[PDB]
Amino acid sequence: KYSEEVLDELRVDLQRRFNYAQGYVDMAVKGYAREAWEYFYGNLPA
Amino acid sequence: TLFVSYDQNGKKLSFANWISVLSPQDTPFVSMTGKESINQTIFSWQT
Amino acid sequence: VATKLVNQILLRDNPGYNIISSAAQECLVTRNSFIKYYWDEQTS
Amino acid sequence: EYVPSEQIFVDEHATSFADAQYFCHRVRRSKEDLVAMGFPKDEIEATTQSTVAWSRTDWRQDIDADIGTDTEDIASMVWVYEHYIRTGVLDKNKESKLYQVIQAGEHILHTEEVTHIPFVTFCPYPIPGSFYGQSVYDIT
Amino acid sequence: AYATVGLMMNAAQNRLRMVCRNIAHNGMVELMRGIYNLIRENGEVPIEVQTPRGMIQVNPKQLPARHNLQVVVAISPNEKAERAQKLISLKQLIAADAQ
Numbered sequence: 278k279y280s281e282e283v284l285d286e287l288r289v290d291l292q293r294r295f296n297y298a299q300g301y302v303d304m305a306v307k308g309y310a311r312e313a314w315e316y317f318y319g320n321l322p323a
Numbered sequence: 324t325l326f327v328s329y330d331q332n333g334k335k336l337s338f339a340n341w342i343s344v345l346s347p348q349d350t351p352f353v354s355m356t357g358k359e360s361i362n363q364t365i366f367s368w369q370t
Numbered sequence: 371v372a373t374k375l376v377n378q379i380l381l382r383d384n385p386g387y388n389i390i391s392s393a394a395q396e397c398l399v400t401r402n403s404f405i406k407y408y409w410d411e412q413t414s
Numbered sequence: 415e416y417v418p419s420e421q422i423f424v425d426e427h428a429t430s431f432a433d434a435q436y437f438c439h440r441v442r443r444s445k446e447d448l449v450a451m452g453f454p455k456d457e458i459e460a461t462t463q464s465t466v467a468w469s470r471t472d473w474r475q476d477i478d479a480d481i482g483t484d485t486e487d488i489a490s491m492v493w494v495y496e497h498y499i500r501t502g503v504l505d506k507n508k509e510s511k512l513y514q515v516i517q518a519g520e521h522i523l524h525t526e527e528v529t530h531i532p533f534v535t536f537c538p539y540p541i542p543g544s545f546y547g548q549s550v551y552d553i554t
Numbered sequence: 555a556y557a558t559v560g561l562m563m564n565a566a567q568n569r570l571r572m573v574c575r576n577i578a579h580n581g582m583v584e585l586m587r588g589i590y591n592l593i594r595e596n597g598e599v600p601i602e603v604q605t606p607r608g609m610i611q612v613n614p615k616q617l618p619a620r621h622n623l624q625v626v627v628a629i630s631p632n633e634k635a636e637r638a639q640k641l642i643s644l645k646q647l648i649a650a651d652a653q
Binding site: 296304 | 356361
């Protein structure tokens, strides 16, 4: 269906987005989720 | 006497500023590298 | 009908107690958590 | 199915599933299903902060461990990027539709237009103007 | 529901009753609406009708819209008994009037 010339363009917009999404969600959420489990398990306080 | 009513041009308009420039500001990295938010001034990682 | 359907689907077919209990305990510490659904398409 | 919060990705301009312009889920899938959709003649196909954050919801486990069944086994499991994006796969002229899109490494398996994102979120103590809420951790 | 004595006026119980009401309206109802659409858009479904007693393949597309549908969640385990007592009360009533 969709031309390979469209799909090789789509791959660029799709990947770039993903790069920014990963960079955001790491600092905004997953950085806290990691320690929140180690607090819940009482591992974290040194 | 002598009413010409042709060259009044009383609009008395000022500057308009509908400019357009073509100074490139692409900066592909800002979109390609990624984005992270840190707290302190210095950061370190291990390898 | 709808009711029967959903319920059956969610509890009598899918492990809905595991789903709901996971999206609770595995949410309250992770800020948000997620549930997701599909049309499955299995063939023997 | 329940999806661990570790396997999801969203854009920073978003606040809700309606408003999201790009969203993705990392899924572990079988070579079988992929064979179902493309590239039969080859199946040798072979992000860490997700793997860490999930592996440390306990310690026993590790999601990137060697499960032991060799890669060639059609029954093997594989990570993929399922996406939901608002974009011009068409010409931008076209209304910006929302697509489901599925990829493996340098292959798109499938696309279709969809009205809606097939996911739900549970959240205590929500925050306005935002996607992600509070947590009992943030509070205690 | 327990105005007998368990009047529930604890800020501790209500700062909890908030969180479950969030999970209901942000979560659970959007899962149901999520399904009802997904189902309403694919496949062929039967229903064990009783009048003739036998699966009616109800074209699912024939179904209504969410527009028209209220959904409720967090049912009492015993709603059955109360519905039944409502019915028998309705029954005594309807019998009371011959019209």
